[PDB]
C-alpha cells in the first residue's frame, strides 16, 4: 500500500510487469547486493522512470559531504512531494547494470508554472573509484537547452570549456574533484559534477521567488539552482527532477549490429 | 481578560468546560502559588498549556538565567504576543504528577506552511539540575525529530553534538552546554544547548526566514531553526511550544521514508 509490491531492475522493468501507480517500489539492479526503495514515475504510455533527485521547496539542505552524497539524503514519499538525492552509489548501480543504456531527463519548473526538459542519451554515473564521473553520449533534445554542454557567460572566452559537465567527476566540499585550484562544491555549498564550476547545477541553493543576485552571497557566487541555457544564472528554479529511463523507451538508422 | 476556570494545567481546565483560548490561572500540584498561563483550547477538548511563542521578533530572547527562570515577554488573551513562561513554571507543570506530559512543537514557514513535532514524556528538571530537558521518544510529526540530533555533514559527530534530550539549560551567564565555548552567549538566547544545536526555537528572529553566515560577524546559524524541517539557514516565522497530558495525544504514522 505505502510500498508497492512489484519489483525489478528499475522502474521500467517494474512498469513492464504491470505496475501502473507512481509510488515507492523496491528495485534490485543487477550488481546490487541488496534491494532499495526508489520512487517510480509511471505514466499512461507504460513509461517507468526511476527518479534520483528532486527539489521543490528548499526544505532539504543540499550541502552534504561525500558520504552523504554517496548514500543519499532527503526523504522518499508515495506522492513524490519530498526533496532528496538517491545517492551516487545507487545512481551508479542502476545506470550501469546491463548493456541497455539509459537516458537522463532533467525536468525543470519555473516560478511562473512553466516546465522544460532536457534529455541526454546514454547516461552513466561511474563508480566511486572514478569519483562517480558523469557521462552521456549526446543531448537528445529538450526545450530547456543543453547546459551540460557548457555555456558562454561572457566573463571569459574559455567559459564554455569550463562550465561543461559531461565527463566531470563528482565533488563535495570535502572531496574536491574540479578543474580548479579552488572549490566549487564548497563555495556553492553543494555536491555536483563541477568543472571550473557549472552551466547547469540542480543541487544549488534554493532561492524563493527564483530571482536572486550577486548581493545574495558575499562573493556574488551564482550558486542557485540554475540551467543557463533556459534561464539566466541569477534565476533559481522552483522545481527540478532528475530521472532515468531505458533508452529504448525514447527512424533513420540501419542496424548493422 | 482572565478566565474563571482553573486547574492543575490547561487540559484540566478543558475537562471543566473551558472553551476559549486565553489566560487562565493554574496551580500545579507541587506549586505554592497559582500563576497565569495561556491555554490553547481546540474543538476536541484538548487544552494545551503554552510555554513559548515567537511570531514577530518583538521580544528579545537574549535574556539571562534569572529571566529565563522567571519568564519574560507578555501573555495576551489573543495569543498574539511572544514570551517564555519561565523554566520554573515549565518545571512545576511538567513534573507535577506521575501523569506523563507530551510536548508539541508547532512551527510556521514564511510561506504559510505549518508542521509539528511531538515528544512523549516531556520533562524539565529542577533548577538544581539546571532545568534539564528529558523526553522518552519522538512521538511523531512532519517537522521531524530535530531533538534527536542532525547530521549536517560538517563533522561525523554532528548528530551526537546536536542532540537535545537530557541537556541542561544554558544562558550566556550560565553555560551548562557540552561545548568548550558558549552556545548561549554566541547565539544570544537561552536553550538546552549541546555542542550547540539541531533545533533551537529561541534563536534570533530574521525577517523573511532566509539569512546567512554573513548575518552575524562570526557566521553563526543562530536563527529560529528546526534542522529536520528546513535548512540551518532558515529561521521560522512562528513557533509554539505547548504541553498536553500524553493521554490526549492522537498518534499517527508519517508518510515519508527518510534516506538521511
Ligand atoms: Ca579544486
Ligand atoms: Ca561551555
Curated annotation (Swiss-Prot), chain A:
> What Gene Ontology molecular function terms does this protein carry?
cell adhesion molecule binding; extracellular matrix structural constituent; metal ion binding; signaling receptor binding; structural molecule activity
The main location class comes to secreted
Question: Can you tell me which residues are glycosylated?
Answer: 166
Q: Does the keyword DNA-binding apply?
A: no
A single Gene Ontology CC term: external side of plasma membrane
* Top-rank taxon, per record: Eukaryota
Q: What is this protein called?
A: Fibrinogen gamma chain
Please give the organism: Homo sapiens
Q: Which residues of the full protein are shown?
A: 169 to 429 of 453
